[PDB]
Amino acid sequence: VQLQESGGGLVQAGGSLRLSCVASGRTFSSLNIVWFRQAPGKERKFVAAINDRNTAYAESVKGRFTISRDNAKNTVHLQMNSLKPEDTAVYYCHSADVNGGMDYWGKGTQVTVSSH
């Protein structure tokens, strides 16, 4: 199936958005969630991951983005602060267990950052 995403939008540079990735099931705490993004004309690239409670960030977003999880609500959040036009992309979340099973994708949600 597919994961559910929300929180995208169009925002002035320097603004913030918070994306959500929501999964169904009873196994959410066992899932590792990864965010990817694709800017127009470019390839899909790693953004951030939460592996149990461990967090990892691409060099381009470290410090500005924070990934977190609320296992009680089956949700991972990506808080994006200090947004730049180069953060404009479709953002996708991906789930899996430790071996690479239980692997699902979200459809993608748009994040657009205008310059001043």
Author numbering: 2 to 117
Task: Provide passages from the article that reported this PDB entry.
Nanobodies are small, stable, customizable, and inexpensive to produce. Herein, we present a panel of nanobodies that can detect the spike proteins of five SARS-CoV-2 variants of concern (VOCs) including Omicron. Here we show via ELISA, lateral flow, kinetic, flow cytometric, microscopy, and Western blotting assays that our nanobodies can quantify the spike variants. This panel of nanobodies broadly neutralizes viral infection caused by pseudotyped and authentic SARS-CoV-2 VOCs. P86 potently neutralized the SARS-CoV-2 Omicron variants compared to clinically available therapeutic antibodies.
To build an atomic model of 2-up+P86, we determined the crystal structure of P86 at 1.60 Å resolution. The asymmetric unit contained two structurally identical monomers (a root mean square deviation for Cα atoms of 0.20 Å); the three CDR regions were visualized well. We fit the P86 crystal structure to the density near the down-RBD in a locally refined map. The map showed two featured regions: a loop-like density between the down-RBD and the NTD of the neighbouring protomer and an elongated density located on the top. We fit the CDR3 and the C-terminal (C-ter.) region into the former and the latter, respectively, and the whole body was adequately accommodated. After manual model modifications, the P86 monomer fit well into the final sharpened map.
